[PDB]
Every structure is written in structure tokens, then in C-alpha cells.
Design a binder for this molecule. Structure first.
Ligand SMILES: Cc1ccncc1NC(=O)CCc1cccc(Cl)c1
Ligand SMILES: Cc1ccncc1NC(=O)CCc1cccc(Cl)c1
Lengths: 304, 304
């Protein structure tokens, strides 16, 4: 009973957080095995930020210039390299708390947990999604760079995001753990506007199924629709077009509830056209799109 | 930038979760030092549930009937006792991962993180609040009993909740770590209806301050009000009455933003009387009440 915006238990990732300081800048790093991963902008000053040449700035840095601290103890840096927008600091000690892990590059619509950190110390955990415009709507202040996003499959942590920047509009941009930014963002203090933040249709439908499973059924109607008809409505409301791949992934939710995917689309179409009329669904007065079909199945079944 | 429903990092609590089985019932337990805390209804069958005499049922149980497993290894139970609605199983081994901790009994309006668990294994973490009717709106399935609620002050975990039951309305009830239920609930499968779930006014105001700090300012108006005038409106809308204690706790938010507490009350009064008009505040189309003034300061300042 009940349905909450739930994050993964953060302990496995907490054991990886370290502090990285270069010159006068301090941010977070991720220590896995004998490598510490952090945003390459740790080497920049408040003058380099406008148009930094990272390869040139890195020439002036040696292993001893990167101060890496895990708790109250210092790690010895024995190598460093730049991979895309991240730095990989080789240390002389493998992290004894290294969990089983993978580096994954997620697609828009996919959700993940963020362990926000400051000075290598975890402050909180929340759930968010890679938006269709490749931004994330996080909660990050100065010092949070290097905080990571991840998913967990039983004992394996799949790291998908590293925090690098805040756009002038208060939304967030970052990279995968290979240092490649999601979307067109660059690690520079320049004009970077985000595209249309469309709604993740498949996630809204998954959340409507979660609502039905939890007893909120007022929005179920006597109608059905087609993918093409539904998509005309989705385009009008800045919703992502629904594909047969999305219909297929909603199969287990349709099977559990007995509500055909296209019938749920017709309920969503009416909600888009008529609004909620001051009513709520799972404690929300808007259509929630940061639960994937997999998240709904996981939470509704109790996967650990 | 950004404001999220953020939970505490769960690692310190993950290290305390164990599985407790008695007869054919399995739920979660909390292992701190050499004691494992769990709901006393672990001793009940699906016949005892209607009207259990716990003292009588416990007479038929010995130390060896409580199976306690921490990961894949079994703990030896050398004592057991009942304290209110919880059982305390003394084990022969102190939990090596015991964090610094306290047991606190929270008041309605206070928020905490929940680490939902099944079979002693953590499934997720979310944030919630002790409602004014002493229920919590969680996400719990069968097997989640014994999952705990907590707050963290730097290195000390303050445990405030242990999950015991779901009411027929899908809301949740439980105890503090001394085994005393919040509210009038009893650990019995009987008719237990919840009282009015009023809105936590001081938390809504704190969240309006968080919105202003994060740039969502459309709701700020040219009006002010008094505590008595505001409270007439709060009563009409099933909001908790605001006191000078609440005004005082909002002082730091008023000081940071320069918006007098009574001016923010007047903005909230207009939002109650006029609605949101299809607009949003911090990504919500309703007034959020599960962030305390302390939560807002913490998240807006980056406390670790
Ligand atoms: C201030 C803040 C808040 C939240 N998340 C992240 C941040 N920080 C930033 O955006 C840093 C911007 C930057 C880019 C490239 C070089 C340099 Cl020196 C700085
Ligand atoms: C099924 C569920 C779902 C979520 N949270 C909790 C639960 N479980 C319950 O409410 C258990 C009710 C109970 C009370 C006293 C004795 C016995 Cl045998 C059972």
C-alpha cells in the first residue's frame, strides 16, 4: 500500500565518496578500485571558467596537486589522466568498500538515484530522471559537483551520472562515468539553454498503473484509443510520442491490472484534455513522469 | 538550485537491518549493539491476528524460536523480552556496524527517512512525515514490518519509527523504538480508522520559503495578515493552527529571504482561497507539507 518517490539504498555509493581538491577548488570524487573519478573542472579557477583549455590547464598539474581524502585519511595519487570531461586519479590503494559496479550511459526517460555530496560527505539521496532535453532536475549547490547518479540491480551498482553544472535556469547537467555529457552541454561558464522539457509519456502511464494498483481509480474511463490518435494528443501537450516499444514495456503492468495499454492511454488523453478538476492521483495534483515501468513493478513487488 | 524530496543517506541504517523469523512469519529487525528490535506481531499466526494476547503467545516462545539472520549468517539469540509492541532479542554478538544512535519519539509534522526492507534486505529509501493524525503515508508491502524511520545529525542516527501495520485505508501505523505506537493504533487486525489528515501549516510555509530561495516567486503578493486572521483560514482548509512557536522556527527562513512570516502567511492564505490556477511551485501543483523548516535550511545550505 502506498506509492512513493523512492531512491535506492545509498550505502554502497556512500562507501565510494571522497573529497578532491586541486589548488583552491574542492569537489567530490568517486573512488572505485584504485581510481578516483571527478569532474575535470576541478583544475579550473574563477578566471579559467569562461573559456578553459583543459588540456593546457592540465599540463600545469602533477599527481601531488590532486589532494584526495577519504574520510579523514589522505590517498596517494600515483597517476592522472583526462577522459572526456572527467579526470581519473590513480591512487595507490584500492577502495576496500568498492561494490560490484558497471558504468552505464542512460537514455532520456530513465530514472536514477542521486547521492548529493559536499566535501566528499553525503548530504542526501533523491530520485530523478534523465529529461528528454538531457538535463536533470536535481538539488545541487556549489560543492556538489562529482556527486553521482546510479541504479542498483541486487548487488551491482550501475553508475550513470556525475554532476558537473547548473544551467542559468536552475536545471542540471552532467556526464556519464566515461566523461561524456548528456545532451549538448559543455563544461564552460557560457550561455547554454535547454531544449523543450517534454513529459515522459511511458512513465506517466506506468505511474497511472501504479495508481490503479494502489486504489486511485477515479481517472479510469470507458474509452480506448490508438497509438496514432493518442500521439496526436501527446504532441499537442508536449508529451513524448508513444511507440510499440513503450506499449511492450508496459505489458506486465497491463497484465497485472487487466487494463489494456491503449485503454490507459485513453484515460491519460482525457486527463490531458480535461485536467484533474482539483482531484489528485497518488498524492499528486499533476501527472508524474519520473517512475519508469520497471520502477513501478519493483516498488509494487518489493524487490530488494 | 533545485529543491527535492530528499532522504538521509541510508548506509548507517542498512548496516543494522536483519531478518527475524518466528515460526512461519518473517519480518525485519534492527540490530544495534547486542539487541535486535522487531515488531512483537512476529510471534503471531493468521489466527492470532484478530485478537492476540501477546503475553500469552510469548510464553510458548523460547530464544531458539527467534531466527535472526544478518546477511547470510545466523545470530545466536541469548535473551528475549517484550517492551510495549516491540520485542528485544539479545544476541551474543554486538553489531560491528552499529552507528552512533538515539531513540527519539517524534511529534506530528516532523519528517524522517524510511528505509523500506524485505527479508532484512533494503529495497529503497524515501522521505515522509508523521501526519497530524499519527499515521504515515509510506510505501510498504507484506514483509516490510520492522523497517525503520530515522533522522541523522552528522554521525548520530536518531531512530523514530518502526513499521507495524497498514490500515484498511492504505495508510501506515507504527511505533517509536520503545514500542509505543504513534497515535491510538493497536497491533491487531481490527477496525482502526484514521482521524482528519490535516495539512502541516508550518511545513507548507517552510516550503514556500524554499520556493522563493529557488526562484519560484509568482505566489508572493502585496498582502499581510495576523496569526488570528490566518488561523481562521487555516481552520476552514483543514490546516493546523499556526502558533508563535511556528513563527519563531521560521525566523531563519524569514531572515534569509527578507519575507516576514506573516507576509508569507498572507501569500499562503491567498493560495488557499484562490488555488494555484494551473500553475506550479517547485514542480508541484499542490502545497507540499512534508518539508520542515529545518529540512529547508539543511537542503538550501548543503549540510552533510
Ligand atoms: C554553482 C553550482 C551549483 C550546482 N551545481 C553545480 C554548480 N557549479 C557549476 O555549475 C560550475 C560551473 C563551471 C563550469 C566550468 C568551469 C568552472 Cl570553473 C565552473
Ligand atoms: C500487509 C501489510 C502491508 C504493509 N504494511 C504492513 C502490513 N502488515 C500488517 O498490517 C500486519 C497486520 C497484523 C497485525 C497484528 C497481527 C498480525 Cl498477525 C498482523
Amino acid at each position: 500500500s502506498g506509492f512513493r518517490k523512492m531512491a535506492f539504498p545509498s550505502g554502497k555509493v556512500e562507501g565510494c565518496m571522497v573529497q578532491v581538491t586541486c589548488g583552491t577548488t574542492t569537489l567530490n570524487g568517486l573512488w572505485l578500485d584504485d581510481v578516483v573519478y571527478c569532474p575535470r573542472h576541478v583544475i579550473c579557477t574563477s578566471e579559467d571558467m569562461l573559456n578553459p583549455n583543459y588540456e593546457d590547464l592540465l599540463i600545469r598539474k602533477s599527481n601531488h596537486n590532486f589532494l584526495v581524502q577519504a574520510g579523514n585519511v589522505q590517498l596517494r595519487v600515483i597517476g592522472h589522466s583526462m577522459q572526456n570531461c572527467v579526470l581519473k586519479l590513480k591512487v595507490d590503494t584500492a577502495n576496500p568498500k568498492t561494490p560490484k559496479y558497471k558504468f552505464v550511459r542512460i537514455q532520456p526517460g530513465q530514472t536514477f538515484s542521486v547521492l548529493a555530496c559536499y566535501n566528499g560527505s553525503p548530504s542526501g539521496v533523491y530520485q530523478c530522471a534523465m529529461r528528454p532535453n538531457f538535463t536533470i532536475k536535481g538539488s545541487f549547490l556549489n560543492g556538489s559537483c562529482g556527486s553521482v547518479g546510479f541504479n542498483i540491480d541486487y548487488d551491482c551498482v550501475s553508475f550513470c551520472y556525475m554532476h558537473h553544472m547548473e544551467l542559468p535556469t536552475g536545471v542540471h547537467a552532467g556526464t556519464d562515468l566515461e566523461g561524456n555529457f548528456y545532451g549538448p552541454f559543455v563544461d564552460r561558464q557560457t550561455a547554454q539553454a535547454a531544449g523543450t522539457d517534454t513529459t515522459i509519456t511511458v512513465n506517466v502511464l506506468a505511474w497511472l498503473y501504479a495508481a490503479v494498483i494502489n486504489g486511485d481509480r477515479w481517472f479510469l474511463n470507458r474509452f480506448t484509443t490508438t497509438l496514432n490518435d493518442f500521439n496526436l494528443v501527446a504532441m499537442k501537450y508536449n508529451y513524448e510520442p508513444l511507440t510499440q516499444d513503450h506499449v511492450d514495456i508496459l505489458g506486465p503492468l497491463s497484465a497485472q491490472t487487466g487494463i489494456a495499454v491503449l485503454d490507459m492511454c485513453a484515460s491519460l488523453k482525457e486527463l490531458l484534455q480535461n485536467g484533474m478538476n482539483g482531484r489528485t492521483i497518488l498524492g499528486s495534483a499533476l501527472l508524474e513522469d519520473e517512475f519508469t515501468p520497471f520502477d513501478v513493478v519493483r516498488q509494487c513487488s518489493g524487490v530488494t
